[PDB]
């Protein structure tokens, strides 16, 4: 039925959620999975949160992404309040009321990366490569592991995702086009698209490729 993870909470805040889950016999875990239904994010009073990996995966999975206030207010009324009333509205990066979480819940039949082939080309920091891959897969993309492995065809849309900061003395992210024919974009193309649950144009994310 229901299964929660939390994100952005202090070990303590996790303990109030833990008390809540225990009382109501709600599944609470530390790791997010396909079975997770709810991601409880720490927010400000207007339901705006920080962009964490769990936030991204929650939206990517079309889950309920709700404020910690759902828990505290529910306790305060000894009732079990409704998620809807506490859905996160935005985040500190992409907009205070972008309604990304609601859009993802409502767009599972038309995923933002449907019809795209994406290679997450390392290295990356703070986000394990296979989690970025899971994120895009949840979002409808086909994951490609090597540059030489993109499917060919006029109907295929390959995209290489990299995080330039992760490299150093390796202006090698400009030399990817020499190995394949696909636009090369920063990981922010993925992150912004997911948070907003709207596939962004590649333009502002594109990385120049040396001929």
């Amino acid at each position: 039925r229901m299964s929660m993870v939390v994100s952005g909470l202090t070990p303590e805040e996790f303990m109030l959620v833990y008390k809540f889950a225990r009382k109501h016999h709600i599944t609470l875990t530390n790791l997010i999975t396909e079975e997770t239904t709810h991601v409880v994010m720490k927010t400000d009073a207007e339901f705006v949160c920080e962009r964490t990996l769990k936030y991204f995966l929650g939206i990517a999975g079309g889950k309920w992404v709700v404020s910690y206030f759902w828990v505290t207010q529910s306790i305060k009324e000894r009732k079990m309040l409704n998620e809807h009333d506490f859905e996160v509205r935005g985040d500190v990066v992409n907009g205070r009321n972008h309604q990304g979480p609601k859009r993802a819940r409502e767009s599972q039949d038309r995923k933002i990366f449907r019809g795209l082939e994406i290679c997450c080309y390392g290295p990356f920091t703070n986000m394990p490569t296979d989690q970025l891959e899971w994120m895009v897969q949840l979002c409808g993309a086909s994951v490609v592991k090597e540059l030489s492995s993109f499917t060919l065809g006029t109907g295929v849309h390959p995209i290489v995702v990299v995080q330039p900061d992760a490299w150093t003395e390796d202006n090698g992210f400009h030399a990817i086009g020499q190995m394949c024919e696909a636009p090369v974009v920063t990981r922010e193309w993925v992150l912004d698209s997911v948070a907003l649950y709207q596939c962004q144009e590649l333009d502002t994310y594109l990385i120049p490729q040396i001929p």
Binding site: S7, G8, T10, P11, R51, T52, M127
Partner: peptide, 8 residues
């Protein structure tokens, strides 16, 4: 929390 955040 110990969880990384992703800002610009």
């Amino acid at each position: 929390s110990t969880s990384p955040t992703f800002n610009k």
